Amino acid sequence: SMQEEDTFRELRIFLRNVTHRLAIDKRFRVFTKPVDPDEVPDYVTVIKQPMDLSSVISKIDLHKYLTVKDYLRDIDLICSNALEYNPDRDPGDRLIRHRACALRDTAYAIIKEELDEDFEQLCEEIQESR
Ligand SMILES: Brc1ccnc2ncccc12
Ligand SMILES: [Cl-]
């Protein structure tokens, strides 16, 4: 209907605002762009599911997120990818891992404080019923 359209627009607006708040945080500057294949020519071979905040924005705007659950799966990728590609004890790796998973914990904490559970449930029930 347009009730349903109104629901998904509100979701998109909410997901944009969360994604913007992550993207202007200095800690996360490295996650605002896909990994450059110049700097890292083995990344896009090793990391099957590249994910970054600019990609998340594109998916919001292409209506690929019908639930916060779907959105958080992509946020989880930004962290799990960082852990997978940068596992070493050296500070370079430890810093990207720390940041990647602080991005994850920030997104979860924002959504925990600001997402109405009943709004997520409505989104889930519309999605399941399609
Ligand atoms: Br730059 C860079 C190098 C290594 N791993 C990375 N993981 C995620 C984002 C950027 C990365
Ligand atoms: Cl830096």
Method: X-ray
User: Which atom of ligand 1 is nearest to 40's Cα?
Assistant: 3
Alpha carbons 91 and 79: distance in angstroms, whole number: 17
Residues 6+ apart with CB under 8 A from 70: 64
Looking at the chain, list the stretches that DSSP marks H as alpha helix, in order from N- to C-terminal side: 2-23, 43-46, 53-61, 68-85, 91-114, 117-128
Map out the domains of the chain with their CATH numbers: 1-130 (1.20.920.10)
Closest CA to 76 of 98, 54, 104: 104
Ligand 1 binding pocket mutation candidate from 85, 94, 103, 104 (most atoms within 8 A of CB): 85
Closest CA to 66 of 9, 3, 123: 123
User: Which atom of ligand 1 is nearest to 78's Cα?
Assistant: 8
Encode 112-127: b = buried (16+ Cβ within 10 Å), e = exposed.
Answer: eeebeeeebebbeebb
Q: Is the CB of 40 under 6 A from ligand 1?
A: yes
